Write a protein that binds this ligand. Structure first.
Ligand SMILES: *C(=N)[C@H](C[C@@H]1CCNC1=O)NC(=O)[C@@H]1[C@@H]2[C@H](CN1C(=O)[C@@H](NC(=O)C(F)(F)F)C(C)(C)C)C2(C)C
Ligand SMILES: *C(=N)[C@H](C[C@@H]1CCNC1=O)NC(=O)[C@@H]1[C@@H]2[C@H](CN1C(=O)[C@@H](NC(=O)C(F)(F)F)C(C)(C)C)C2(C)C
Lengths: 306, 306
């Protein structure tokens, strides 16, 4: 029993983190085989961040302008190139700790673990979701750029996020590992704002199932609603609309608790209209939307990795 | 910016987890140098759990009754002994991944990371606090026994917790690594209950400072109270009393925000008497007590590890 915001074990990623210095700017890089990936703005100074021309900045650099350290060992850079918003640094030594990996682009509502790093050294691990407005609510200080987000599928690490910047509302924006931004952001110091965020409905439902599995039942009722009646209520409260695909995804949780998806929507419908009235669910007084259906199954059934 | 429930990177611990089988019972063990530590009830069957006599059960075993696997490699057990509630299995191979480590007993209110494991394989990592009633609010399924809790101090892993059991309220109890239980619990299937829990006041204050650092200021006020006036209010709400040592510990956070500890107590005093009234603090509608002052400093200043 119990329910916690659980991250993936980070061992396989810790062995890939390196420190990248170019000029007076130091940040983190990801070392897989003989390539080090890092944010391209490592080649920027202060004069450059308002309106950088990265093609110009890069041609004016040579391999020896880039200092790559894996702990104390220095890595010799033998070639560099730019792919969208990431720099790919070819080095003379392949990382012997390279795990089986792939590069995936995730969708809003999906979750991943973040290994926050400073100077190539891992500082902490935490779980978060990609918000519907393509930002993440992370915890990041100066120097954290190049920290990566990831999932683990059996033995395979899927990298899905590299950190680039903090927006003025205190939320965080970055790229996939091919260097393409999530959301309409750019890596310069211009005036950028996230769009309005919405609550991830399928995730709230998954969390209500986790609560039932763990013995919190007080919000249930006998009513049933329809997909269209629910979605009409959800839009009023800035909740994402629910689709038949979401219903099917919630199947395993419905079967395990004997509570039909559309039954649970009627409970959620009541919670949105009447509030929780000083009661808590799994130790929270707000509705939690950063657990996917698969997170709940994994934590309430006990899937491991190798 | 931002604030997350952050765990320590788990790499150094992942390399020490093994699977221990005795009979039809399999659980996790901790492999440091040539010793494997695991819960002693691995030597129990179903008939034994109501009233086990562990001295009798252990003398009736030999080294070959214990199957230890580190992934696929089998470890040969060359000797065994009991230390309080843990079994120490001497093996013929010293773990080459043994980190610099020590065994520490933590106090109520302190936090640590948990590497949850099944069959020797790491499943997830999460942060929790040792509650004033010596339980932890973990997330654990069947087979998770022998999972460990730990902190990292620079390069040194301090192991502080090994998991043994779930209580009927759904909370979790275990031992330090010398096998001594936290709290008045025993490793048998008798009727045991945790005592009443209290809120960890020094931790709530640290979290309020984190909120100020991150721009949440709405709960502040101009009032100041005394230690005795505050503690008189805290006891009414089942909060731990505040000591001068706690005040001193909150020093760095007071200096960074320019808000005196006793000023912040007056805000907390108001929040306890009037509630939060539909407002949130760092994304929570309840007062959070599982961040120590040191957790806040670490996350809002950016201490790494090597
Ligand atoms: C990478 N090392 C940092 C990470 C930041 C620092 C505070 N927390 C974080 O997540 N990234 C940057 O310094 C990037 C960098 C220039 C500007 N920048 C920012 O994060 C700034 N934000 C923006 O300009 C905005 F609002 F547009 F996103 C800052 C004002 C420092 C928060 C570049 C090249 C994008
Ligand atoms: C170790 N593999 C498990 C971990 C448990 C299973 C569910 N979640 C957990 O944390 N530990 C046990 O099976 C221990 C084991 C006998 C009884 N036991 C329990 O956890 C049981 N609880 C108690 O007997 C109680 F209430 F006294 F704590 C159970 C009913 C299965 C929850 C021994 C030797 C203590």
């Amino acid at each position: 029993s119990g329910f916690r915001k659980m991250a993936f074990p980070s061992g396989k990623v810790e062995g890939c983190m390196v420190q990248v210095t170019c000029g007076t700017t130091t940040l983190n890089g990801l070392w897989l085989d003989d390539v080090v990936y890092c944010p391209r703005h490592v080649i920027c100074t202060s004069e450059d961040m308002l309106n950088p021309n990265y093609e110009d900045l890069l041609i004016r650099k040579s391999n020896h302008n880039f200092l790559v350290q894996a702990g104390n060992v220095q890595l010799r850079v033998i070639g560099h190139s730019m792919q969208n918003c990431v720099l790919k640094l070819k080095v003379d030594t392949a990382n012997p700790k390279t795990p089986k990996y792939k590069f995936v682009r995730i969708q809003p509502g999906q979750t991943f673990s973040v290994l926050a790093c400073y100077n190539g050294s891992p500082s902490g691990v935490y779980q978060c979701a990609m918000r519907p407005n393509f930002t993440i609510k992370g915890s990041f200080l100066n120097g954290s750029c190049g920290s990566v987000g990831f999932n683990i599928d059996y033995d395979c690490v899927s990298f899905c996020y590299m950190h680039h910047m903090e927006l003025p509302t205190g939320v965080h924006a970055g790229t996939d590992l091919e260097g393409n931004f999530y959301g309409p952001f750019v890596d310069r110091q211009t005036a950028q704002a996230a769009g309005t965020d919405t609550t991830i409905t399928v995730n709230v439902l998954a969390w209500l199932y986790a609560a039932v599995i763990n013995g919190d039942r007080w919000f249930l009722n006998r009513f049933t609603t329809t997909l269209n009646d629910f979605n009409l209520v959800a839009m009023k409260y800035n909740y994402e609309p629910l689709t038949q695909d979401h219903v099917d995804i919630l199947g395993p949780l419905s079967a395990q608790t004997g509570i039909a998806v559309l039954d649970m929507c009627a409970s959620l419908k009541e919670l949105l209209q009447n509030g929780m009235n000083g009661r808590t669910i799994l130790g929270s007084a707000l509705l939690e939307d950063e657990f996917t259906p698969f997170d709940v199954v994994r934590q309430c059934s006990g899937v491991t990795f190798q």
